[PDB]
């Protein structure tokens, strides 16, 4: 049971790294004045990529 526990904490840390990665998708491109980065979003494609 604690092995299932530690594996689900490994999935929890996967969730934590993914949510930190989505927050560090957002912090370079909040909605910069330029509001157009194909060179960012055309390579990253993490989440909600469609805003230029």
């Amino acid at each position: 049971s604690v092995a299932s526990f530690v594996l689900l904490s490994m999935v929890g840390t996967a969730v934590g790294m993914c949510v930190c990665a989505r927050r560090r998708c957002i912090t370079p491109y909040e909605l910069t004045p330029g509001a157009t980065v194909p060179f960012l979003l055309s390579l990253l494609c993490c989440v909600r990529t469609t805003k230029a």
Partner: protein, 151 residues
């Protein structure tokens, strides 16, 4: 109301918030609430690292927004309290024009295009070199000289 946009908290100006391009911008360090209830209900994103608050501008207000440019030639620019000298990679102001509370003022050129937002300033006697947050080739960058005070 030419360029003036403002967040106010319990009667006192807590700096200013500005909608610029497609963003609603507010310094994160300014505590309190936007003094327009229609604005106050949008989804706001906070960044402590850069002290930035951003929101998506609603469509029906888009036509009041300022034009922008990433390109900042050396010269003189405009802000709320007058001329702003830019040269040497250095933005400067006359000492006393800015104080805690003035964070959020836009800097705009002779065509009224905003190029930077004031974050604070470092008094060096006769002149004050301002600490600033700005953007260049779509990347946000904060420039802080040593010994700068938050406004």
């Amino acid at each position: 109301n030419d360029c003036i946009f403002e967040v106010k908290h319990e009667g006192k100006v807590m700096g200013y918030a500005c909608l610029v391009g497609d963003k609603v911008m507010k310094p994160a360090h300014v505590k309190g609430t936007i003094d327009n209830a229609d604005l106050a209900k949008l989804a706001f994103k906070r960044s402590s690292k850069y002290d930035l608050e951003c929101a998506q501008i609603p469509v029906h207000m888009k036509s009041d927004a300022s034009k922008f440019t990433h390109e900042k030639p050396e010269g003189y620019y405009n802000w709320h309290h007058g001329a702003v000298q830019y040269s040497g990679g250095r933005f400067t102001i006359p000492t006393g024009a800015g104080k805690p509370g003035d964070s959020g003022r836009p800097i705009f050129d002779n065509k009224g295009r905003v190029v930077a937002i004031v974050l604070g300033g470092a008094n060096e006697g006769a002149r004050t070199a301002l600490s600033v947050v700005t953007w260049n080739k779509d990347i946000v960058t904060k420039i802080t000289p040593e010994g700068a005070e938050e406004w």
